[PDB]
């Protein structure tokens, strides 16, 4: 329960089976670390029976949206949750609704 280290939505290096298992309702979301891509983040949130994984950091280490930026990845999840707005990326409005829960991974 402290920064990305134990944030309420940051689960940590998750897998494709566990992350998808956390999406029980269309709207739950969570951030994890790309296992194949060391030094990258991802957002596995269900929008309506179709999990969407978006990289929180672009190929040049830069979190942003269709026309915005996030000083920190935590600022990204708190920005969309502040106005229930989507994240958008390449044709997918990943909308957030309820953060899952971990607070323990990330080290």
């Amino acid at each position: 329960a402290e920064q990305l280290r134990g944030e309420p939505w940051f689960h940590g290096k998750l897998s494709r089976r566990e992350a998808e298992a956390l999406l029980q309702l269309n709207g739950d979301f969570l951030v994890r670390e790309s296992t194949t891509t060391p030094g990258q983040y991802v957002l596995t949130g269900s929008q309506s029976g179709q999990p969407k994984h978006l990289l929180l950091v672009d190929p040049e280490g830069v979190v942003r949206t269709k026309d915005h930026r996030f000083e920190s990845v935590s600022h990204l999840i708190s920005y969309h949750m502040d106005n229930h707005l989507p994240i958008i990326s390449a044709g997918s409005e990943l909308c957030l609704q309820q953060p899952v829960e971990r607070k323990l991974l990330e080290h």
Binding site: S34, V42, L43, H53, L54, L55, L56, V57, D58, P59, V63, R64, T65, K66, L76, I87, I88, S89, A90, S92, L94
Partner: peptide, 14 residues
């Protein structure tokens, strides 16, 4: 290459 791609927020380019 390809891959699985994930994405990103954002972009776009190219």
């Amino acid at each position: 290459g390809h891959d699985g791609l994930y994405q990103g927020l954002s972009t776009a380019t190219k």
